[PDB]
Scaffold this motif. Structure first.
Motif, PDB file in Angstrom:
ATOM      1  N   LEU A 101       0.848  -1.185   0.000  1.00 46.42           N
ATOM      2  CA  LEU A 101       0.000   0.000   0.000  1.00 46.42           C
ATOM      3  C   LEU A 101       0.883   1.235   0.000  1.00 46.42           C
ATOM      4  CD1 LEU A 101      -2.348  -1.843   0.282  1.00 46.42           C
ATOM      5  CD2 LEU A 101      -3.012  -0.714   2.414  1.00 46.42           C
ATOM      6  N   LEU A 102       0.850   1.984  -1.086  1.00 45.45           N
ATOM      7  CA  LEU A 102       1.546   3.254  -1.145  1.00 45.45           C
ATOM      8  C   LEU A 102       0.537   4.387  -1.022  1.00 45.45           C
ATOM      9  CD1 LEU A 102       4.323   2.705  -3.835  1.00 45.45           C
ATOM     10  CD2 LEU A 102       4.167   1.935  -1.460  1.00 45.45           C
ATOM     11  N   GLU A 103       1.052   5.592  -1.195  1.00 45.77           N
ATOM     12  CA  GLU A 103       0.253   6.799  -1.105  1.00 45.77           C
ATOM     13  C   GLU A 103      -0.387   7.126  -2.445  1.00 45.77           C
ATOM     14  OE1 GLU A 103       3.232   6.303   0.235  1.00 45.77           O
ATOM     15  OE2 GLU A 103       4.576   6.748  -1.439  1.00 45.77           O
ATOM     16  N   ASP A 104       0.369   6.935  -3.528  1.00 45.60           N
ATOM     17  CA  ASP A 104      -0.075   7.266  -4.872  1.00 45.60           C
ATOM     18  C   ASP A 104      -0.729   6.098  -5.595  1.00 45.60           C
ATOM     19  OD1 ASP A 104       0.924   9.950  -4.810  1.00 45.60           O
ATOM     20  OD2 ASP A 104       1.404   9.782  -6.949  1.00 45.60           O
ATOM     21  N   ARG A 105      -0.503   4.866  -5.144  1.00 42.82           N
ATOM     22  CA  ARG A 105      -0.932   3.690  -5.888  1.00 42.82           C
ATOM     23  C   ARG A 105      -0.880   2.475  -4.975  1.00 42.82           C
ATOM     24  NH1 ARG A 105       3.835   3.458 -10.270  1.00 42.82           N
ATOM     25  NH2 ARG A 105       1.893   3.409 -11.491  1.00 42.82           N
ATOM     26  N   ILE A 106      -1.590   1.428  -5.379  1.00 48.81           N
ATOM     27  CA  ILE A 106      -1.386   0.084  -4.856  1.00 48.81           C
ATOM     28  C   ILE A 106      -0.614  -0.686  -5.909  1.00 48.81           C
ATOM     29  CG2 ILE A 106      -2.502  -1.735  -3.530  1.00 48.81           C
ATOM     30  CD1 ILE A 106      -5.045  -0.244  -3.573  1.00 48.81           C
ATOM     31  N   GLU A 107       0.436  -1.382  -5.495  1.00 45.25           N
ATOM     32  CA  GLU A 107       1.263  -2.144  -6.418  1.00 45.25           C
ATOM     33  C   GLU A 107       1.147  -3.623  -6.091  1.00 45.25           C
ATOM     34  OE1 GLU A 107       5.241  -0.607  -6.731  1.00 45.25           O
ATOM     35  OE2 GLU A 107       4.560   1.368  -7.403  1.00 45.25           O
ATOM     36  N   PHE A 108       0.869  -4.426  -7.113  1.00 44.66           N
ATOM     37  CA  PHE A 108       0.708  -5.864  -6.974  1.00 44.66           C
ATOM     38  C   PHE A 108       1.906  -6.562  -7.597  1.00 44.66           C
ATOM     39  CE2 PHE A 108      -3.733  -6.028  -5.565  1.00 44.66           C
ATOM     40  CZ  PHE A 108      -4.165  -4.760  -5.903  1.00 44.66           C
ATOM     41  N   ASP A 109       2.358  -7.629  -6.948  1.00 43.86           N
ATOM     42  CA  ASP A 109       3.537  -8.365  -7.395  1.00 43.86           C
ATOM     43  C   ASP A 109       3.324  -9.826  -7.034  1.00 43.86           C
ATOM     44  OD1 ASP A 109       5.739  -7.600  -8.910  1.00 43.86           O
ATOM     45  OD2 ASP A 109       7.130  -7.947  -7.240  1.00 43.86           O
ATOM     46  N   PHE A 110       3.082 -10.662  -8.038  1.00 45.87           N
ATOM     47  CA  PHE A 110       2.722 -12.058  -7.822  1.00 45.87           C
ATOM     48  C   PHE A 110       3.719 -12.952  -8.542  1.00 45.87           C
ATOM     49  CE2 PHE A 110       0.288 -15.914  -8.993  1.00 45.87           C
ATOM     50  CZ  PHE A 110      -0.027 -16.361  -7.725  1.00 45.87           C
ATOM     51  N   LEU A 111       4.338 -13.863  -7.797  1.00 47.49           N
ATOM     52  CA  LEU A 111       5.220 -14.874  -8.364  1.00 47.49           C
ATOM     53  C   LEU A 111       4.439 -16.175  -8.475  1.00 47.49           C
ATOM     54  CD1 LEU A 111       8.722 -14.181  -6.864  1.00 47.49           C
ATOM     55  CD2 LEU A 111       8.344 -15.105  -9.161  1.00 47.49           C
ATOM     56  N   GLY A 112       4.258 -16.653  -9.702  1.00 44.40           N
ATOM     57  CA  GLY A 112       3.497 -17.853  -9.965  1.00 44.40           C
ATOM     58  C   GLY A 112       4.379 -19.040 -10.286  1.00 44.40           C
ATOM     59  N   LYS A 113       3.773 -20.045 -10.916  1.00 49.90           N
ATOM     60  CA  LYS A 113       4.505 -21.243 -11.299  1.00 49.90           C
ATOM     61  C   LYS A 113       5.574 -20.905 -12.331  1.00 49.90           C
ATOM     62  CE  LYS A 113       2.981 -24.153 -14.439  1.00 49.90           C
ATOM     63  NZ  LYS A 113       2.202 -24.960 -15.415  1.00 49.90           N
ATOM     64  N   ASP A 114       6.664 -21.676 -12.308  1.00 50.66           N
ATOM     65  CA  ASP A 114       7.806 -21.467 -13.202  1.00 50.66           C
ATOM     66  C   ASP A 114       8.399 -20.075 -13.040  1.00 50.66           C
ATOM     67  OD1 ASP A 114       7.576 -24.087 -14.524  1.00 50.66           O
ATOM     68  OD2 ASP A 114       5.786 -23.226 -15.477  1.00 50.66           O
ATOM     69  N   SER A 115       8.195 -19.483 -11.861  1.00 54.36           N
ATOM     70  CA  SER A 115       8.771 -18.189 -11.497  1.00 54.36           C
ATOM     71  C   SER A 115       8.382 -17.076 -12.469  1.00 54.36           C
ATOM     72  CB  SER A 115      10.296 -18.281 -11.372  1.00 54.36           C
ATOM     73  OG  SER A 115      10.696 -19.521 -10.797  1.00 54.36           O
ATOM     74  N   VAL A 116       7.216 -17.180 -13.108  1.00 54.10           N
ATOM     75  CA  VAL A 116       6.724 -16.057 -13.896  1.00 54.10           C
ATOM     76  C   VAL A 116       6.240 -14.975 -12.943  1.00 54.10           C
ATOM     77  CG1 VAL A 116       4.527 -17.281 -14.133  1.00 54.10           C
ATOM     78  CG2 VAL A 116       5.009 -15.291 -15.555  1.00 54.10           C
TER      79      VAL A 116
ATOM     80  N   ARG B  15      -8.939   2.118  -0.191  1.00 54.03           N
ATOM     81  CA  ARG B  15      -7.763   2.049   0.668  1.00 54.03           C
ATOM     82  C   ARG B  15      -8.123   1.539   2.059  1.00 54.03           C
ATOM     83  NH1 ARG B  15      -2.758   4.486   0.888  1.00 54.03           N
ATOM     84  NH2 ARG B  15      -3.210   5.831  -0.918  1.00 54.03           N
ATOM     85  N   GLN B  16      -9.284   1.944   2.578  1.00 51.14           N
ATOM     86  CA  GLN B  16      -9.660   1.560   3.934  1.00 51.14           C
ATOM     87  C   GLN B  16      -9.912   0.060   4.045  1.00 51.14           C
ATOM     88  OE1 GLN B  16     -12.933   3.843   5.572  1.00 51.14           O
ATOM     89  NE2 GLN B  16     -12.661   2.905   7.593  1.00 51.14           N
ATOM     90  N   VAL B  17     -10.688  -0.508   3.115  1.00 50.43           N
ATOM     91  CA  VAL B  17     -10.989  -1.938   3.168  1.00 50.43           C
ATOM     92  C   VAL B  17      -9.728  -2.767   2.933  1.00 50.43           C
ATOM     93  CG1 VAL B  17     -12.368  -3.787   2.117  1.00 50.43           C
ATOM     94  CG2 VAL B  17     -13.386  -1.535   2.531  1.00 50.43           C
ATOM     95  N   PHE B  18      -8.799  -2.269   2.113  1.00 57.03           N
ATOM     96  CA  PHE B  18      -7.496  -2.918   1.998  1.00 57.03           C
ATOM     97  C   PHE B  18      -6.760  -2.891   3.334  1.00 57.03           C
ATOM     98  CE2 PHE B  18      -7.105  -3.038  -2.766  1.00 57.03           C
ATOM     99  CZ  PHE B  18      -6.719  -4.364  -2.812  1.00 57.03           C
ATOM    100  N   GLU B  19      -6.657  -1.706   3.943  1.00 56.03           N
ATOM    101  CA  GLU B  19      -6.088  -1.587   5.282  1.00 56.03           C
ATOM    102  C   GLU B  19      -6.819  -2.490   6.266  1.00 56.03           C
ATOM    103  OE1 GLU B  19      -4.214   2.986   5.630  1.00 56.03           O
ATOM    104  OE2 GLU B  19      -6.347   2.592   5.973  1.00 56.03           O
TER     105      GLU B  19
END
Lengths: 522, 521
Positions: free
Chosen positions: A293-308, A324-328
């Motif tokens: 959770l940032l101030e300007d954006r939410i950033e998603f980063d997902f490592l899946g199978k075969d390290s994609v 933002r609140q429900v995420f928090e």
């Protein structure tokens, strides 16, 4: 012959309307509504907060059926001269009631119970001694007709169907199930179980067995029809998602956040078992380390199978504070490796979606997203750039690639990708030389055609490296868009599809594509 | 479907024979190589059509034509090319072909080679049975045309070779001569050959004769030609009138028969189909059937079935050549004499074909019936179509209008007057059953049967003297009714019997945007 014996219980007829004693006002005059009049006034009021009741074609169509229920009077009343306030307020009190959590569950518990009882009674047929499930054994209640958004009969009344209207298909010596059926036939050349005429459109409606071509084609088309209906009302659906974020129920606040991810990232729910998407990112697969959770954006980063690695971000500028609140609220007091969405499955998400637009689901939502991406991409292409069938296929696949990215169908590169790209580069270099040594016209044309395929295939192979195009082509891209693409440019759209997909989309042959072709031609 | 299949493949088209022609590009004379000439000659054959004036047609054609000049002339517009030399060649063999002394020997080569290739390729043996093949000739390359507004009109259709073609044969069946690109053993398919159209990408198939696939193809082809005629009807009419002014008397007579097709949808008279064999035709018109008056021409024809057909043409806005040729043909004849001396479909279709390639009397009358139906339905306010039954009612009224236009008159059904009475009685009984109905369920079912009864009564009165089935089956483009169904929302399939739905299966996948846009104005 398709069957020698056929035994079933007919169809379930819709329950009668229950009058509420409501009234309307016409030109300031109070009119106590009769049953049929109230039934239609109630159907109109349910749509009071939708655009349809503002559509002049919709209004006049409704009025054509509504005014006929007052034979003798009000023959020339227009929509502004009717005060539906009493019926609007009843609908509001109905929504007021369903705002209680434990009042929703008790109603859904009994509607499930009545459905389970009727399904044992009507849901099963015996054909040649084998017991088969019946797909659509319920006769739909009357209501206001709606098409894909521009149907010429939108707003007309769908009159009630009775047992007397219905033909049953049965074996010659099968017992006739209870009911005052219109007629019994013994049609061994047809596998439909019941049939009747639509009392508005005149279309024949059939009851089919589950898992037959007829019911699969009909349901397949239905998904894409619902997605097309979303095109005109996506704005209202989004506002209702934000409203769920403001809920006082924590379960509904979380479910609404998942739907918000569908809308903004085309992210699946996460609980579909089917293998083509089961390894891609989804809501239920998100964990604390995948979201920052940032101030300007939410950033998603997902490592899946075969390290994609899959990375996407949502801009939080101008977004309501509720996201933002429900995420928090879901992130508070949670460690790495902990699941973010713990009370999420498709049934919960689709119930929340269905309350906004009936029939709306995650699969329909992402179909609307994928299809719109394909349309917009193709619409931007100047016709003069589509110079051959090969180039036509090339652009269609690039559009397919765009939908794959939107729906997060990322994959590890094919095992020998770089060397496969190597071999495509040498073949086109080889094919270009063979063309500049080819002398007569037959060979110069045949080698030019093979060359053209090769360079476009090469560029495609490079661009599709990280994405699985087949998933969206089979499940999320309306085939009417490609058929319209073919009509617009004149090239053969059927070469976009494998034989299996052409069977799956057999219904597109008969379907109108005017809605999309008008967009391409504007 | 089949377990043994043997055939000789398909006859590929003969190569282009160069003529040594030239064109001028921006004043520069260019000697055409073979492929350039082949394309320029295909363009010159359309010199007298509107297509060469369509900018989309020209640009599409130039896209392929300019690619043949090895990098030069890539920005030449059609205005900068002088095709006069190729035009003159086309005209001089049009003059040559029109001479009957040249048509005598033009037949001398049409009684030899035709049957020799058909014996080679035009027969298949399936399960030991010998079946005729329908479309064994691969069509030559040429300029592509759809129904008038195809986005690729003008583009070149490249030549097809054996290497592009797939042959469907048995597992141990002998592979015939040719460098075929692919052999398959598909037992679930009745086609003999297949290849991809080199411009559109569409799969083309070779079928056996008298099969459903070839009939659908040829059925749609007739209606496609009729739709295309909408864009040439002004020229066809002007060419008919010019034929009436011709100094040659056989031309004047053929033109007047064509004029009667245009004005009265009158068949030629020599078609053998019994659906129309008793109706008036040009070849059966006799002097006693025609009254030439000061302000009109009267037609009055009594058939072998005791059916009297009467129509009149108002002469006030017809050109004077119509009266002139009619006077010419009637002069000095007894009332029992035939008006037309040597009229048959071949002479008529030869005259029409020289105006529009492929135009026949049958296509002309298909265009007429279809236009009649379209115009009747376009004039109906959408709000007047309040139900499936009213939708069907208007569809049948339009079918009646076409039946009248095409002279499909019939003797009334032997028990007509009583049938009308029975329909009047049920209207009266259903009126009371609705006047005495209590529940809304009963009031709805009875009123729906009532409006169905009154509509069917009006219809039964109006359709008494006319055979609607003939034009519905043979002359009305079913895309008009599909479009009418889409425009209003109702079920157009109910217009057709199960047999007609089978015959018109191709309409389910066919576009109706052409008609739908006409309705939607």
């Amino acid at each position: 012959v398709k069957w020698r014996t056929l035994v079933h219980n007919g169809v379930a007829l819709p329950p009668p309307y229950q009058p509420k004693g409501l009234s309307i006002k016409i030109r300031g005059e109070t009119v106590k509504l009769d049953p049929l009049q109230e039934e239609m006034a109630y159907a109109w009021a349910l749509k009071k907060d939708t655009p349809y009741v503002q559509d002049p074609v919709f209004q006049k169509n409704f009025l054509t059926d509504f005014l006929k229920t007052f034979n003798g009077r009000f023959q020339d009343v227009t929509i502004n001269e009717i005060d539906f306030s009493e019926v609007y307020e009843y609908v509001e009190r109905e929504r007021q009631l369903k705002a209680d959590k434990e009042y929703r569950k008790k109603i859904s518990a009994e509607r499930k119970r009545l459905r389970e009882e009727l399904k044992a009674r009507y849901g099963w047929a015996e054909m040649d001694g084998k017991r088969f499930e019946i797909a659509n054994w319920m006769v739909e209640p009357p209501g206001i007709f709606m098409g894909r958004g521009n149907h010429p009969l939108r707003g007309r009344w769908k009159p009630r169907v009775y047992e007397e209207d219905i033909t049953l298909n049965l074996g010659e010596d099968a017992p006739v199930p209870p009911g005052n059926w219109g007629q019994i036939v013994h049609d061994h050349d047809s596998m439909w179980l019941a049939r009747w005429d639509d009392k508005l459109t005149g279309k024949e409606k059939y009851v089919w067995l589950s898992d037959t071509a007829d019911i699969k084609q009909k349901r397949d088309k239905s998904k894409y029809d619902k997605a097309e209906m979303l095109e005109n009302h996506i704005d209202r659906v989004r506002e209702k998602i934000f409203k769920g974020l403001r809920s006082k129920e924590p379960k509904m606040r979380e479910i609404a956040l998942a739907c918000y991810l569908i809308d903004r990232l085309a992210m699946r729910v996460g609980d579909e078992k089917d293998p083509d998407e089961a390894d891609t990112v989804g809501a239920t697969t998100l964990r604390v380390e995948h979201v920052k959770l940032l101030e300007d954006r939410i950033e998603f980063d997902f490592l899946g199978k075969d390290s994609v690695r899959w990375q996407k971000s949502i801009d939080l500028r101008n977004e309501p504070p509720e996201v933002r609140q429900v995420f928090e609220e879901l992130l508070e007091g949670k460690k790495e490796g902990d699941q973010i969405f713990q009370n999420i499955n498709s049934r919960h998400v689709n119930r929340f979606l269905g309350k906004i637009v009936k029939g709306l689901t995650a699969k329909v939502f992402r179909t609307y997203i994928a299809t719109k991406i394909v349309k917009d991409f193709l619409a931007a292409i100047p016709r003069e750039k589509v110079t051959s069938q090969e180039k036509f296929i090339y652009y269609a696949k690039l559009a397919n690639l765009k939908a794959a990215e939107a729906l997060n169908h990322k994959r590890a590169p094919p095992k020998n990708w770089e060397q496969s790209i190597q071999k495509k580069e040498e073949r086109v270099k080889k094919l270009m030389q063979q063309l500049r040594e080819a002398e007569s016209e037959k060979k110069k044309a045949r080698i030019a055609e093979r060359l053209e395929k090769a360079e476009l295939n090469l560029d495609l192979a490079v661009k599709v490296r990280d994405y699985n195009l087949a998933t969206s082509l089979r499940n999320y891209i309306d085939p009417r868009v490609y058929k319209a693409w073919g009509r617009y440019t004149g090239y053969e759209w059927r070469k976009i599809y494998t034989a299996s997909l052409l069977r799956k989309f057999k219904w597109v042959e008969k379907a109108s594509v005017k809605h999309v072709l008008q967009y391409f031609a504007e």
